[PDB]
Symmetry: C4
Subunit: 373 residues, 4 copies
């Protein structure tokens, strides 16, 4: 284990995964100015430590939507985790659970709402795309009836982002074979062996006797995307769903406030990890405004790789941070154990950062610890 | 092939064109800080999407100078397109009309005012350089009588810009042969064959028994450039031309306002794609100001390569964007089909961008969708 | 040789030291954005020279904590200098005294408090880490009774910084052998020979019959670090120590002011040379503010390599600058002579800088000689 | 002649000159952040052209210190031009004269005050270092008696800058032979042949039967530098010199104003081409302030390579721009003809720039043509 940070796991993923799958994981939209901006924006703050503060007893635990967890991270929703590691959705969820944090299941998961709730008893969240009311109500109810605590509505994939790595690779659900496909698979024998042994992953929440192939399932899922979803549909969802409701994919304090007005319990500021709109702002640019404007839980993702990144968001008011690629690196490098190791480092990293800035209780973070640069 | 954006066609044009011709198309003035700045300035804005907006039915069509077109782009005027592809002016013109947008013919075209109007029935514009009243009145009249709808006066080539790529290549109108020339032509057989079969392109609006070679046509054209053209000459032109009149090459709101005061119907903010003055501002720096100061159509060019670039200019108030090199890459790679394809990508790209930022009708764009950085 | 500045000695140290030891000396925390920022920040000021000032007689001497020295530098505290050169602590100490400046011995030195005082008669300072009162009182007392004039309390190593060079190299106190270790030692025969002849360096202030190996000494030292050290413990130390007391590792004027309030004689602004917290501010960002807020001696370190760096800190109000790596490069390249030489270059460099900016007496420096940029 | 700008001549110099001489010409002080800043600062302004202005008749001529010249450039003072080209001082002066502009002779020239006035009838300036009154009065009077019109006092070389290229090369007046010297001379046969044919250049203003070698002359010149020269000595000089007096090497409006108060007719803002103090401001940073503060001629140098650079200084108020390296490139590349060609380009370049920004009369330049960026 010569692995000391998230980036060491990224490097390991790139060796195990075929170029085509790594490009699906790593790529962003168009020129990828956005993913770069998602990282660079964190250099806009530096730390002003408070010295001679007793930090001998540190606590990372905190309340997210009124419920205590061991640190303010979550494993956020990502589709097709089964391309990365067998039963990857369950790997992630078990690691989140051992680490004391929630896991968010994707509409596009390779393991169904119900199979995951049957095999793991952590705090499971479900994320729903913007889709047409009928089959949406079908998923929401399966999540209700199996004990999912909070529902996430992702609003930033009405239409698909223009990801040119996937276009250059021809990475699309009807795959077939190719000079490049076979070659890519052959130079990555560990993954290909895993792939033959276990088979093509399925869009498990679209499976049935009648839609029994991936090509069939994806076609159904894209037919269900609803680019007309508006504030009215959100009220419909608020009324259908009795527990915690969050709106994901927002990039303004104004939309954040409107979501709360229509009944949301909180929001997730996000640009989908730079995968949807290359020239979108980072959510860090509207965090403090959205926190000040709403007074309700503001969570955030997009670009987080280091404990200092996370700490900066928490000091500006964020209730918690969702990990996408960071823990996905652990998954495809080393499976469920990889995810455990990444969360173990990030916890140690957050904990070390709190020590060095003189703030022993994570809930007492504030901009006072930041220099604006 | 793998052609998914404008840059992929640049790569393709660079392979087909001989180095000297590629350098005439691509180059800018002196150090080329200006062409660089023309691209970089677009990073001064990022997008704040509005979510939970119905974007299932999008419209790109808009009024330019009171006339509806399918999207707010134009193929702007560029000279010597016949160096890029046989009958290059008509190719560009036929593609613009299929796509539903105007095409602007250059004073320096390889096909004459009249011959283009006899071969294309789109919305044709004519651009006139600052030149001496006599032969200017001649071209203006040919254009009026052949049904051109709009006249644009280009005001930024009083003197020739200092383009050091052409100087180092010895790319000048008395060409002759050389070790390098022949070598360049021989390494580009598709283009050289096209050139041998079809001959030396000619300045078609300067052809006559007396100026029967390209050298004589260019000698005449540069002797006709009139660095004294002032506000008086503009009024003279305004009285001579009864239809829509635009002034191109402005880089201040004050000059824009004066152009409107002297009867112009609108302006084109431009620095000639960085080809005339390396240290000129980008026209994006004075776009919002010119829109507020004149209240008349403000169009713009210089630097546009991505749909996101175009959308940012439209949200700051521009009526439309003219393309120079972007559609010239398609022309020089694959002719009229290449041009079609580039316009097809840019229309889809603009449309996708509108979807992602939550603005379904292009006419409702505003700075509200922008963050200034 | 061709040794004309500090960087030339870095190049020389890098050739003699094995890669693992060079990485312990050179490395910083995590991404090393901090060490980079420590250098770059000096570019935020440029010089406005005053001309037609008589600068024929220049003086570098100045009062630090009321005591005259030949120039306003100190060799600050660094641990494990014996890894760089035999008797490295004494070499540094003997060179400082020849140059007329204090030397600060580290808690983590390879030569004991008492043995250094028996072998050098300069102005010796002792730096104490934040540790448990019992053995702290022991070292403080050894230093008082052996004639140390100043005590500095380093407050920024509650927890160890995350230095990934050492982790990737497996550079840890239970070392052992390896393919890479032996290879590294064999490619650096001068250093390896020195190491074989002289043995494993020891934490000399933690030596006893029971902690008779380096592993045991380091085990003891890290168990003695006291993350609870607070303002109360500082008063305790203030009463225990009768002479000059400084607090090192501060990064705010507010903490500086509190340190003065609790009896300290001055402070050292520091981020431990970027080794503890990658995203910490440079202390130059809070230098002028700390000087104005306390009105007491404000010293500084972190990033200094050029005489111009030093002069800029002095014009903003700093009483003196401590050197870490700069004089360690001289030590590891050429021992006590290397250290002498580096101090000789830096004194000449400071003196030349004063000549060029028209300020003949170092004590009259002021921001008036600076432009903020 | 494939030479279209100053940089093409720099490239040519580097091939003809031995590395050691090129490094003396090109190098700056220490890290050479200063020369880089001297270039980069010009990117802080861009141009806002005025359109539809009659620029058919352009004039470059202007008054410098009340005397008309053909363009507001000067060839400024540089020592050891005879290392670059035989009788280089006379080459430069003849080119300045054919181009209609003054030439400034250096104290450190390879041709004496009197020999140059005997062989060229242009507008000759003399620059004097800060030196001890006696031999200074000897040079000032020779310049007076031979018709030099203006005297320049250079105040920024009290002590020598720390130029590490010269230190690495051992480029010092007692040269001798060496592995590197002979090798350098052998790989540059054109220059070495020139050097044997004509001999070691001499500090011609320090020549006599008694100080008849370069080693003797340089020793005398460095003994005469007077780091005590102050405002009193300046008044002495003002009284000794009856014609125009300028003070060179200033970097503040305050010193500029003081020079005028003590009788100077104007100042030259300069940092000696980045050769004296790496971290000095560019003089462009205090140009507009010095122009506004004094109301007397403010000239400038340091960093000028392009006509746009020059134009920007003139629009901020500068009376004229002195060239150092720019015309020295022409000299060592191609002798007197090289200097002619460089000035011909720069005139064409200034003239083209005025056309493109719509300002036909150079005296009507103003900040109105600039955008601050
Ligand atoms: C405009 C909208 C377009 C829709 C965009 C949809 C993009 C989604 C990408 C679909 C990829 C389907 O995910 C599927 O995963 C399987 C197993 O995990 C992998 O399987 C495939 O890739 C590997 C690459 O070496 C090959 O060895 C294998 O033979 C091939 O079938 C691919 O990853 C893909 O077949
Ligand atoms: C601290 C202050 C130090 C004082 C600084 C003084 C630096 C000044 C540099 C002095 C160089 C004297 O300039 C003199 O020029 C002659 C002819 O032009 C050149 O002559 C020399 O260089 C060339 C290099 O190839 C050799 O071939 C030749 O044999 C050698 O003598 C050198 O340039 C130098 O000898
Ligand atoms: C491969 C991949 C698949 C994703 N799938 C989904 C998804 O199915 N549903 C969703 O709401 N967000 C999805 N996301 C977005 C993440 O939830 C999250 O917003 C993003 O990854 C955070 O950016 P980061 O990767 O830099 O941490 C996906 C992200 C990636 C990288
Ligand atoms: C090869 C080339 C030729 C051009 N010729 C003309 C021209 O003849 N008349 C004109 O008004 N503008 C001309 N232009 C400028 C363009 O009309 C347009 O202003 C510029 O290309 C826009 O910048 P862009 O290439 O970055 O899109 C030319 C540009 C290029 C690159
Ligand atoms: C190898 C090394 C060891 C150090 N050891 C100590 C130490 O033991 N105690 C301490 O207070 N500071 C220690 N420091 C920090 C230095 O005292 C000083 O604050 C820092 O080196 C200044 O930055 P600079 O290297 O850029 O000059 C150490 C620094 C280095 C590089
Ligand atoms: C090789 C060289 C020698 C110089 N010698 C002198 C000199 O003897 N006296 C003087 O006043 N300035 C001298 N200068 C400074 C120039 O006069 C001028 O200030 C500087 O070169 C302008 O910067 P630039 O080279 O970027 O144009 C010298 C500059 C160079 C590069
Ligand atoms: Na299910
Ligand atoms: Na003389």
């Amino acid at each position: 284990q010569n692995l000391f940070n998230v980036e060491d796991y990224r490097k390991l993923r790139q060796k195990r995964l075929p170029k085509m799958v790594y490009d699906y994981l790593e790529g962003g939209a168009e020129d990828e100015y956005g993913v770069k901006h998602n990282r660079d924006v964190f250099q806009q703050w530096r730390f002003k430590p408070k010295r001679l503060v007793d930090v001998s007893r540190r606590s990372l635990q905190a309340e997210v939507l009124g419920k205590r967890q061991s640190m303010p991270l979550l494993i956020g929703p990502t589709g097709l985790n089964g391309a990365l590691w067998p039963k990857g959705d369950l790997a992630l969820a078990r690691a989140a659970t051992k680490a004391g944090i929630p896991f968010v299941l994707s509409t596009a998961s390779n393991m169904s709402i119900e199979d995951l709730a049957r095999q793991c008893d952590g705090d499971l969240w479900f994320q729903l795309y913007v889709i047409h009311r009928e089959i949406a109500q079908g998923m929401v109810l399966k999540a209700l009836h199996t004990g999912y605590t909070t529902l996430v509505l992702t609003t930033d994939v009405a239409v698909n982002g223009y990801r040119e790595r996937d276009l250059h690779n021809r990475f699309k659900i009807p795959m077939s074979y190719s000079a490049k496909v076979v070659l890519d698979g052959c130079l990555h024998p560990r993954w290909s062996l895993d792939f033959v042994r276990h088979g093509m992953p399925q869009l498990a929440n679209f499976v049935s006797s009648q839609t029994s192939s991936l090509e069939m399932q994806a076609a159904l899922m894209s037919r269900q995307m609803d680019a007309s979803f508006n504030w009215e549909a959100l009220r419909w969802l608020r009324d259908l769903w009795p527990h915690k409701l969050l709106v994901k994919g927002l990039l303004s304090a104004e939309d954040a406030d409107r979501c709360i007005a229509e009944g949301a319990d909180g929001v997730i500021l996000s640009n989908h990890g730079g995968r949807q709109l290359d020239c979108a702002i980072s959510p860090m640019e509207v965090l403090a405004q959205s926190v000040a404007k709403t007074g309700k839980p503001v969570l955030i993702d997009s670009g987080f790789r280091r404990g200092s990144d996370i700490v900066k968001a928490l000091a500006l008011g964020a209730e918690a941070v969702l990990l996408g690629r960071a823990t996905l690196y652990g998954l495809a490098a080393r499976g469920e154990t990889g995810v455990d190791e990444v969360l173990t480092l990030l916890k140690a990293d957050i904990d070390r950062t709190l020590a060095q800035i003189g703030c022993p209780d994570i809930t007492s973070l504030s901009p006072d610890y930041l220099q604006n640069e």
